[PDB]
Amino acid sequence: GPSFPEPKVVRSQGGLLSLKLSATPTPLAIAGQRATLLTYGGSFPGPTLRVRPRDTVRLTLENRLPEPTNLHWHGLPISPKVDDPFLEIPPGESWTYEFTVPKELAGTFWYHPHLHGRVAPQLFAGLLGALVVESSLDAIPELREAEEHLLVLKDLALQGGRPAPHTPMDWMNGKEGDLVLVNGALRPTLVAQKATLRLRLLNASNARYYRLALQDHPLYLIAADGGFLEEPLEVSELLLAPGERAEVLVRLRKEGRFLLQALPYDRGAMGMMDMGGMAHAMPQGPSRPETLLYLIAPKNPKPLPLPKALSPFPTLPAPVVTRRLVLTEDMMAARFFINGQVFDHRRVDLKGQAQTVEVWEVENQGDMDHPFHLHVHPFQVLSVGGRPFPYRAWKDVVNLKAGEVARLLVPLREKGRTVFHCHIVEHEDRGMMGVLEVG
Amino acid sequence: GPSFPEPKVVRSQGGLLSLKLSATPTPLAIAGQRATLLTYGGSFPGPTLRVRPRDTVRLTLENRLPEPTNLHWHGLPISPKVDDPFLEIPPGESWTYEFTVPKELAGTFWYHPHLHGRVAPQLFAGLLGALVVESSLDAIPELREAEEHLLVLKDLALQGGRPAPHTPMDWMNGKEGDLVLVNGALRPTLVAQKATLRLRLLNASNARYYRLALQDHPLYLIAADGGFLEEPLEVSELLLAPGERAEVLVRLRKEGRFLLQALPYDRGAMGMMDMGGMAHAMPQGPSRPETLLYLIAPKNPKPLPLPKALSPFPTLPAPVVTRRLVLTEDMMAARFFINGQVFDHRRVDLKGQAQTVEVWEVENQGDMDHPFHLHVHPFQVLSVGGRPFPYRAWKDVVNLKAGEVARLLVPLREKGRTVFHCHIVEHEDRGMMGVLEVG
Numbered sequence: 001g002p003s004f005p006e007p008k009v010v011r012s013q014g015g016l017l018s019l020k021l022s023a024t025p026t027p028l029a030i031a032g033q034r035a036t037l038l039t040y041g042g043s044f045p046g047p048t049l050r051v052r053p054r055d056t057v058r059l060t061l062e063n064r065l066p067e068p069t070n071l072h073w074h075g076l077p078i079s080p081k082v083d084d085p086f087l088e089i090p091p092g093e094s095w096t097y098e099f100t101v102p103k104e105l106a107g108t109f110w111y112h113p114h115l116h117g118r119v120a121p122q123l124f125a126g127l128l129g130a131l132v133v134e135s136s137l138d139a140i141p142e143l144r145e146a147e148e149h150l151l152v153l154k155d156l157a158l159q160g161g162r163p164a165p166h167t168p169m170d171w172m173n174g175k176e177g178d179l180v181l182v183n184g185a186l187r188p189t190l191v192a193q194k195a196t197l198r199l200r201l202l203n204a205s206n207a208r209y210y211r212l213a214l215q216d217h218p219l220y221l222i223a224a225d226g227g228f229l230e231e232p233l234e235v236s237e238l239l240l241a242p243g244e245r246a247e248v249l250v251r252l253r254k255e256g257r258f259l260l261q262a263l264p265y266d267r268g269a270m271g272m273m274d275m276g277g278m279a280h281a282m283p284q285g286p287s288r289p290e291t292l293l294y295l296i297a298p299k300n301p302k303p304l305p306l307p308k309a310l311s312p313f314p315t316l317p318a319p320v321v322t323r324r325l326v327l328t329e330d331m332m333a334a335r336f337f338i339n340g341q342v343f344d345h346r347r348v349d350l351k352g353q354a355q356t357v358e359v360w361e362v363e364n365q366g367d368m369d370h371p372f373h374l375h376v377h378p379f380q381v382l383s384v385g386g387r388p389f390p391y392r393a394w395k396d397v398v399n400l401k402a403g404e405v406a407r408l409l410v411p412l413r414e415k416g417r418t419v420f421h422c423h424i425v426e427h428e429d430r431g432m433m434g435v436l437e438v439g
Numbered sequence: 440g441p442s443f444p445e446p447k448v449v450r451s452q453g454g455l456l457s458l459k460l461s462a463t464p465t466p467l468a469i470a471g472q473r474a475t476l477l478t479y480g481g482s483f484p485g486p487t488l489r490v491r492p493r494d495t496v497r498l499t500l501e502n503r504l505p506e507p508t509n510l511h512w513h514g515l516p517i518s519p520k521v522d523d524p525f526l527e528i529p530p531g532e533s534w535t536y537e538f539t540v541p542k543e544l545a546g547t548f549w550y551h552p553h554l555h556g557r558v559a560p561q562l563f564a565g566l567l568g569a570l571v572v573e574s575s576l577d578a579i580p581e582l583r584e585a586e587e588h589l590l591v592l593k594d595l596a597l598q599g600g601r602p603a604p605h606t607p608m609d610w611m612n613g614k615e616g617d618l619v620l621v622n623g624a625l626r627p628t629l630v631a632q633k634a635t636l637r638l639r640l641l642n643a644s645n646a647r648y649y650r651l652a653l654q655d656h657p658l659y660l661i662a663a664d665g666g667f668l669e670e671p672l673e674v675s676e677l678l679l680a681p682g683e684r685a686e687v688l689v690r691l692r693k694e695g696r697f698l699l700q701a702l703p704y705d706r707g708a709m710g711m712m713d714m715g716g717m718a719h720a721m722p723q724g725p726s727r728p729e730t731l732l733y734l735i736a737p738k739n740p741k742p743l744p745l746p747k748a749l750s751p752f753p754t755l756p757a758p759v760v761t762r763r764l765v766l767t768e769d770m771m772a773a774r775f776f777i778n779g780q781v782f783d784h785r786r787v788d789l790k791g792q793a794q795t796v797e798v799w800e801v802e803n804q805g806d807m808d809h810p811f812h813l814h815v816h817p818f819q820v821l822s823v824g825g826r827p828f829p830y831r832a833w834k835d836v837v838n839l840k841a842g843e844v845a846r847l848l849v850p851l852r853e854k855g856r857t858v859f860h861c862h863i864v865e866h867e868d869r870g871m872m873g874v875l876e877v878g
């Protein structure tokens with residue numbers, strides 16, 4: 001096969017992407033070993049769905065797992081009557097998701113389970129895939145002529161040829177695995193054929209962070225979770241928290257081998273120690289550095305010029321309400337809270353009005369990083385930790401370190417009941433989720 | 440008696456104003472004629488209650504009317520568990536209102552009935568009185584040395600020695616009377632003994648407006664409904680809508696007789712005409728000019744200097760929500776609406792958070808003037824009809840002409856359920872009222 005493994009792509013045909021996908025235990029070869037994972041479409045990751053604005057998507061999910069499941073169309077500003085976080089597909093049953101891709105949309109999105117209390121083990125076991133919305137902006141020469149790849153960043157741990165079970169500490173921290181993979185492959189080699197690469201990045205891990213850095217190179221950020229920036233932004237490194245996506249341009253500067261690494265990052269995960277009358281929580285500290293892939297540059301690379309502009313960010317109406325949502329932790333209980341409460345699917349927490357804009361101030365009063373996700377309604381990050389964001393773009397997950405406040409501008413789009421929650425999915429399963437009703 | 444009739448004053452004693460007041464049909468002499476009015480304390484207007492911040496008020500209202508009644512402490516930022524717009528005192532029964540006067544408070548307030556569907560006939564019949572909160576600011580020489588008077592502006596119509604009954608047209612327009620009185624007197628004479636007068640003004644009429652102008656003199660506005668301005672504001676005339684209060688300084692310029700008039704004002708009241716196939720609504724046009732009182736200046740008047748400053752207006756926290764409240768009319772049905780609904784005491788319309796500030800945009804989409812009143816939570820008028828207000832002061836009624844939008848800054852104070860409504864009280868009785876719950 002191609003030196004660089006990427007998931008199989010399924011494309012819309014004549015404006016329709018009609019596909020049946022089964023969620024199923026699947027024996028497969030992974031990182032040189034045989035394992036049974038839970039997959040969509042018999043692969044890990046699941047197939048990449050590639051569509052254009054205004055396409056119709058008709059996806060029938062057949063549940064062949066021994067427990068109920070469903071889909072979250074992560075990042076898609078569609079109706080919560082379609083992207084329904086409360087729906088349950090029982091074992092053996094099927095459900096058809098049908099929606100139209102919004103006209104003003106572009107970027108890398110993804111799909112995975114969202115059945116409360118069962119997300120972490122299902123996602124950890126392999127149930128996820130990417131969805132790419134192609135844009136007319138892809139036709140500009142500076143992007144068209146780049147070599148494009150999707151990088152699904154997901155780790156895994158195996159025990160007896162199956163995904164390792166969650167421990168109590170896993171429910172507290174979020175589970176990370178020792179196999180740190182790209183597109184389900186262990187440290188693949190990308191042999192570049194062009195000097196400019198356009199990489200779509202997805203963190204589909206339960207809890208692992210990727211502090212991304214390419215040896216000897218900067219990255220040029222061109223898209224965030226849910227759309228393009230206004231112009232490329234040069235960065236020395238790029239942190240991708242669970243659930244986040246980014247698109248970058250890489251401009252290969254000379255021939256050679258360059259490592260794309262996940263540099264040490266301390267997200268505040270905790271261990272336990274006993275030092276002669278202790279038995280108390282201790283920080284795990286920063287992650288060990290990981291090599292994600294080997295990047296081989298072509299001979300005499302001459303990268304393209306960067307595009308001067310991408311997409312202008314919409315001018316939003318003035319906001320009509322300000323909300324405050326405080327995150328707290330009970331680590332030893334592995335319970336997690338928003339405004340002092342745990343999720344209750346019967347309780348509406350916030351009531352907003354469609355087509356108005358709100359300001360959400362999300363404050364992390366815990367000690368762990370928490371990546372805050374809102375369904376259905378993409379937002380503009382204004383500032384985090386009192387620092388203004390250096391670009392305008394649509395996001396749907398925002399990482400908060402301990403103590404930090406994020407100020408978000410949230411246009412309310414589709415009507416209905418939806419949710420917001422931490423995307424360390426163990427924390428969501430353990431209660432860190434709330435309900436927004438838009439009318 | 441004194442040439443200038445003013446209601447009897449009852450003052451707190453040792454920090455307590457403890458008083459029993461009966462609401463009762465009372466034969467009395469009024470404007471040279473004998474009539475039976477409904478009064479508090481056997482007088483029209485009822486007695487003026489004069490208190491200081493931190494005083495305790497203990498007022499037992501005995502209901503001697505043939506229908507239920509209650510009190511609204513108009514303008515007082517106290518608890519809606521005390522100023523309870525839903526409470527009913529049945530005929531023959533009593534209820535004791537007990538509250539502490541807030542520390543940061545000054546001005547002219549008033550009391551009258553607020554039993555939904557019965558306000559207009561009860562207020563029209565004579566049930567109202569003033570409450571004055573004395574301030575340490577009263578001790579400054581420029582105010583202390585002024586001659587002070589209360590002017591209760593209230594009109595009346597009599598039929599068979601009793602208040603004239605409401606007609607259907609009265610329920611549509613709000614009832615106005617031909618006897619245009621000051622302190623229950625017909626065109627009294629005020630023989631000034633000092634060159635500077637300090638006049639506390641109260642519009643306690645059901646619906647009549649007072650476009651106030653003193654012949655040959657400006658007025659110096661020093662207080663609005665619920666407190667002092669920051670400094671005196673010179674005006675050529677001053678419109679007082681139903682429920683509003685103001686305090687002015689008058690600086691008598693020369694000897695002579697000067698008329699205080701209610702100049703012609705068109706509030707959009709409607710009549711009916713038939714011109715050969717008609718039978719449709721027609722504007723009544725501006726009110727006829729009224730003389731309110733005769734003001735006789737003393738010999739060689741030398742008025743005091745104006746105070747340079749009054750009270751600094753509080754700096755308010757940034758608002759956390761913006762509300763829109765649209766007023767509409769069904770004139771021929773005499774029904775009046777807020778956001779398309781009529782009052783329902785069981786329905787909560789707005790839910791806010793105590794100690795936050797909200798912006799309320801109130802829009803009059805009708806053709807009549809509507810004076811919008813909010814209980815419990817005094818507001819700062821920012822602009823009306825797109826014109827910035829020329830002063831900062833606490834208000835609790837704001838007049839909107841046809842088409843106008845008022846933008847108000849509303850700090851939410853005491854918790855509980857309260858109401859907002861038009862203070863053309865017929866319109867409130869006919870549905871133009873809503874419910875705010877503060878928690």
Ligand SMILES: [Cu+2]
Nearest residue numbers: 072074112243
């Ligand atoms: Cu997700």
Ligand SMILES: [Cu+2]
Nearest residue numbers: 370422424427
């Ligand atoms: Cu979390």
Ligand SMILES: [Cu+2]
Nearest residue numbers: 072114373375
């Ligand atoms: Cu979710």
Ligand SMILES: [Cu+2]
Nearest residue numbers: 511513551682
């Ligand atoms: Cu009132």
Ligand SMILES: [Cu+2]
Nearest residue numbers: 809861863866
């Ligand atoms: Cu009205």
Ligand SMILES: [Cu+2]
Nearest residue numbers: 511553812814
């Ligand atoms: Cu009222």
Ligand SMILES: [O-]
Nearest residue numbers: 072074113114
């Ligand atoms: O999710």
Ligand SMILES: [O-]
Nearest residue numbers: 511513552553
């Ligand atoms: O009232």
